[model samples]
Target: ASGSSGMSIVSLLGIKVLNNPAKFTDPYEFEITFECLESLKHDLEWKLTYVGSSRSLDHDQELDSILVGPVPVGVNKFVFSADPPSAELIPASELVSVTVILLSCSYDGREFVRVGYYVNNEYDEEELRENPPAKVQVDHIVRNILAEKPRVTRFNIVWDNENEGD
Candidate 1:
C-alpha cells in the first residue's frame, strides 16, 4: 500500500489559542489538535512560522518549531508558546500571524503529504463544523462521534431443532 494512504487520511481537526486574562499577553500559547486514521510509524514534523509584530518587520526570524513523532492512531494535541524579546513587546492592535506546516512521510523519508494552514483567531464549533477545507469532512465525523446512542433490539432465536421441541 502507498504511504500516501495514511498521510491523506490524517486531518487537522482543530487549533486553539488559550488566551488568558481575556486578551493576548506576553508568552502567548497555542494548541493544535489533529487526528489520524491509522497509526504513524514515523515522526511527523511541524514547522511554525511567526510573522507580524511578534518578529521583526521583515519577519525573517524563525521560532522553534515542534517535531511530533510516531503519533498514535487517534486525536493528538501539541501546544506551543512564544516569549518575545524583553526589548520587543507585541502591540494589542498588531495581530500575530502564524503559519503551521505539517509534514508526513514514510519510513524511508519519502514525502507523502504536506498540509499547511494559516493559524489565526479562534473559531466557534458551529463555524468550524460549517466551514472546513476540501479534505476534511467535519460534519460527517461530528455526526458519527457525537450522535446519540443506537437503539437496543430485543430478539431471541432457536438454533437447534431439539431446542424448538423442548
Candidate 2:
C-alpha cells in the first residue's frame, strides 16, 4: 500500500504446445495460461519466435505476434497459432540439429515474462537419419517441441503507479 512498483498485476500460469511431433510445414499452436490480479485496460501482447541458430540473432525468425485481451481478472487461457519458420533461411548445418522456440508476453507495451523451449528437427524415416542428405529436405524433416521441460523467466515492469520503487 505504500507507493511502489512493488509487484506486477499480471503473471504467467502455464504454457504448452498443441502439437509435439509435427511436420515442419505445419503451423505451431501454443496453449497459454495467465492470470491478472485486476483488470487491464489494454490487450496483452504475445509473440512466438523461432531461433534459427545460436550463432546470430539475424537468423532468428519472429513467427507471429498477436493481442489477446481486454483481459479478465482471473486465469485466462487461449490457443495461439503461427506459421513455421522459414526452412530455406535456416543454415543447412542447423537444419538436422536442435534449435529453440521462444514465446513471450507483454502488458502496456512492457515485457514481463517469457517462455522458451528446445525443438529438435530430424528425419521421419530411420533411413534418413542413418544416411542424411546434405540438402535440407523440406518434406522429410519433423519438428518436435521438447515439451517435457520449459524455461520460464520473469522481470519487473511498471504499471499505473505514481512513483518508482518503494
Candidate 3:
C-alpha cells in the first residue's frame, strides 16, 4: 500500500491549554489532538514557534520541536510543553502587546498544518500596564492565551511510502 497520495494521513483536531495560560517565566503547556485516517511509521515533526512583533523573521523563535510518531488510526492526543519566550530577545513594547504563537506539524518533510493563537501579556498593576519597564519584567508579565480564536492553515503534501507503514 504505497503512493496512495492526495490528502495527508493525519490532521490537527484541536489544541487545548493545559494550564492557565501561565506567567512569562513559567513553562507553557499545550495538549494537541490529531485525527488520523491511517497509521504512520515515521514520526511527525512538530514545532512550536513565536511570531514576535518585528516584521523581520529574525525576531521569531522556534520555541521547541517535538517528534510525534508511530501514529495509529483514530484520535490521538498528548501534552506538549516548553519553556517561555526569551524576554531578553523580544522587544519590551512587543512583549507587553499581543503575540502570535504557531504550532505546526510535518508528516514527512513538508508542513501540513499550522495552528496559530494570540497571547496577551500584561501586568495587573495599572502603573505597570501603563508603562512597562525599560527592560521587560519577565516575571511580572502575565501571559493570557486567547483560546477563543485560532487561525489554522492546512497544506497539501505528498505522503511518503515509508509513512504508509511497513
Candidate 4:
C-alpha cells in the first residue's frame, strides 16, 4: 500500500490499501483506509476512475459525499467491491489501475482538501523499484507539501523593572 501525510483544515495523515494484492475480475474486493489529524464532522466525497486499461468494468463508478463520517480523529476506513460481468475479465497478463480520489471540506464548505490513491491489479518488485506507481508519486508530493511548517511572527518587548514590584 502507498501512503502519505498532509495538512489542511483537517490533516491527511495517511492512506493505504487494506488488501495487499487486488484482483482484476469479478467479486473484486478491497478496502482503503485514511488517517486524519482530527475527526470530520462532514462526509468524505470520493470518486473512482479506471486507468491504464481502455476497457471499462462493470464496477467502474463514482460516489458523491458518501458519509464515511462522523469519521474518528485518527483512522477512517472504507471498503470497495465490484461484481463485474464475466465477459469483462481481462487477460491475466494485463494490468488495470483504479484511481480513487478522497476529499473533505470545512463546515462552511469554504476550505477543502483532496487526496488520491492508485490501486493496481499486479505488482512487480523489480519494475516498482525502477518505476514506482502513480500512487507512490502522489504520496511523495503530499509528504513534501506536509513537510513545510507555517511561519510565525514574533514580538520583542522589554520593560524596565525600575519600579520594583510597585
Candidate 5:
C-alpha cells in the first residue's frame, strides 16, 4: 500500500493525439493531473518521475526529474513527452505505441496521497503483464513523490521521460 505495485487500480483513460502510431515525427506529449482528498502533513514532500516501457521485466530505460511540492490539497499536472525530436504527434486513428509511465508513492517520513491517471478504454492484458515496470521503476517514483511533497501540499504532476537530462 506504500508503493506503486501496492497501489490499487483506480481508473485508466487515454487521450488520442495522433492519427497514426507507426508514423514517426515529433515526440508525443501528455499531461497527467492529480487531486488530493486529504491534507498533507508537515515534513512530507511528494516527487514525480517517469518510467518508460510497459514491460515489467525491465527497468525503465531513462529517468526524468519532475515536479515536487508540499502538502495541503489541490490539483497538479504531470506532463509526458514522446521520444525523438523528429517524432511528431500524430492524430487519433492509428495506435501502436506505449504512451506514459506514471510512478507514484510516499517517501522519507511523509504521508502519501491517492493519485490517478487517464487510462485508455481499451485494456491490454498481455501488454500490461509483459511490460511491467521493474521494481525500481515503482519504488523510485514512490520515494520521489514522498520527498517532493513537503508538509502542506497534496497534488503533483510528473512528466513522462521523453527528454534527456530532465
Candidate 6:
C-alpha cells in the first residue's frame, strides 16, 4: 500500500505485482521546424518561432524574433518549450515560425550591394571592416529552407528596410 523506506508494488497483469527502485532517464530530442516567410515589419525585426516541448510538454510553443530578410538565416535552436520555465507536453496543432533578417549598411560613403548568397544563410560580407550584418549590402538573391522534420512545422523570412531613412 504505502511505505517510507522501500519500493512499492502495484497490480500489473491483474494477478501480478512488482516493486523496484526508480531510475533516471534521458530526455527525447525535441524537433524544431522553421516555417515560411509570414510578414515583414518596418522596424527591421525578424520574426522567428518554433514548435516543441521539453520531453514532457504537449502544447506547441510560440515565440518571435527580429525580422531581417527572405533567406535561410541561422536561428537559435529550439529543443525544449519555446517559453521559459518550460514544462509539460505540447500538442501537434500548435505550429511556430522563425524569422531571420539582414541589416542594411554602407561603406566608404556608398551603399554596398548584394550579389549572391548561399542557401544556408551564409553570405559574403568579408569586405567590411566591422563585418556587421547592418553594414554589408545584401543582394536580391534570397535562399530559404522549405521543410521541418519530425517536430518543427515550418519557418519564414522578412526584411526591414522601411525606416532606414535613406
Please identify which of the two predictions, 3 or 4, would achieve the higher TM-score against the true structure: 3
Q: Report clashes for each candidate as comma-separated counts.
A: 0, 1, 0, 0, 44, 35
Can you give the lDDT of residue 40 in candidate 4? Answer: 46
1-166: candidate 3 lDDT, tens digit per residue: 2553566788788888878667777887888897888767678888888875764442468888878657778899978887776765677545536777888888767888988888887875788877667766677778888987989998877875645456
* Candidate 4 colliding pairs: none
In terms of lDDT, model 3 sits at 0.76
Q: Candidate 2 at 12: error in angstroms?
A: 1.1
TM-score of each: 0.42, 0.86, 0.85, 0.36, 0.29, 0.17
Q: Pick the winner on lDDT between candidates 1 and 3.
A: 3
Candidate 1 regions off by >4 Å?
1-7, 20-25, 53-57, 82-166
In the range 1-166, model 4's lDDT, one tens digit per residue, is: 0311123334444333333333333233335565656544565543333323434443334332333456566766667543422333332323343333223323333324444444433343566646655442221211011112222221221112224465
Q: Write the per-residue lDDT of candidate 1 for residues 84-128, one digit (tens) a residue.
A: 222232322332323232222223243333333333332225765
Error of 4 at 58 (Å): 10
Cα lDDT listed for each candidate? 0.39, 0.79, 0.76, 0.37, 0.32, 0.24
Best candidate according to TM-score = 2
Off by over 4 Å in 5: 1-28, 41-59, 80-166
Best by lDDT: 2
Q: lDDT ranking from best to worst? A: 2, 3, 1, 4, 5, 6
What does candidate 2's lDDT look like per residue over 52-146, in tens digits?
65454424688889998578888888888888877656766455368788888887788888888988888888878898787778778888899
Ranking by TM-score: 2, 3, 1, 4, 5, 6
State in Å the error of residue 161, model 5.
30
Question: How far off is residue 94 in model 2, in Å?
Answer: 4.1
Alpha carbon lDDT at 90, candidate 4: 34
